[PDB]
Amino acid sequence: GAMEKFKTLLYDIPIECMEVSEEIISYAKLQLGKKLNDSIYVSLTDHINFAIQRNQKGLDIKNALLWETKRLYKDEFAIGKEALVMVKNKTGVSLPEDEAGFIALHIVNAELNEEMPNIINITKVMEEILSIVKYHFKIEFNEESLHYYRFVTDLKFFAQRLFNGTHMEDDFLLDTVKEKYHRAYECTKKIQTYIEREYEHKLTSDELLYLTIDIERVVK
Amino acid sequence: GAMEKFKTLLYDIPIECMEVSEEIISYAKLQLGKKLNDSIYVSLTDHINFAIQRNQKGLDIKNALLWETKRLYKDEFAIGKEALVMVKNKTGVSLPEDEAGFIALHIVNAELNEEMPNIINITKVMEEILSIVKYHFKIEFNEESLHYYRFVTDLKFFAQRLFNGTHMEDDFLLDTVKEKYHRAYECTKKIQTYIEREYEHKLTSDELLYLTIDIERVVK
Asked: Are the C-beta atoms of residues A95 and A51 closer than 8 Å to each other?
């Protein structure tokens, strides 16, 4: 049919692919405890089928977002890791960890129809800090610059740490930027105080250093 | 059917969803010039359908990997951005940029059956630098630590810059870490020389600073 490709997989689907897809999703539902978009069954059936085909032809894939996925979508990644074990059990094929990341993203997609609290929290703090810098210097960001990319990535790092409750050193590296980049540091202090008072969270010396350099790079 | 969910979408698919899916994929193929897994038609039909449903019920989604996607999958993200325009043209709905990121990842998935040169290059350089640090200190990395996460993220940043040919300041921030973290800096110098000689690429003062701090944090 001319419209078959929009709604169904266009090939003879191996039963084993459907079996492992169901096994993975059953485990995902057990761990997450939330409803998942039924299309996850289609997406994983197809994904595992071609993941195996790639491995069989000697193509070892690489996932550019592997580490960020592991950190930001910890629960989905854990399921993705177990999924690779299930695939090995079913087919005898050992897929690279990179595939656990892609499986994790398929699960995230199936979860998009309900709010994701941790993501909302992290993005909220990022927005708040960006707002402080914009207002302090009365500037608009060049969101295409590599410096802005570094800045926003650092802010996500900070926000993640804040909501993970992870507790951590040496101010020697900060005392130096304080002198040369004093204007940027004035804003760093405002952010430090805001975060400590609003979230009872203390940024580390390293975070304050990165924040100061980031502000200097993006504002100048 | 008991197996329908593994191969087809389980609902009355709006014709408009298939229409915009085809429009987006036609453009993706025009821009990328490569073959795409036919399942991309199913994935995007379903994705846009629920993306619109989310918007209509007041759920504004957030994409935790938005910036990394924009940077690492530039071409796919550009298509994702244009896709949001096509969706607006078809339905009158303006989706958040976050959705452009998810659309980009669906495209990346459809491209996984052929090598992706840029990704291979970036990951190769990351591996080479990690190898230098491991061999220099005769250590094994605690890949679960936040310090390792920062380290590997920085390495990807460096590698991306290297293959993007992006040219950029002040060594004052490096002269300081040279004294306190001298052992780490000895390794920073080896990496700097390796990258300059092997790739004709010069790391910046900022990159050398981050690299030195990263090594100190991960080794100690």
From this structure: yes
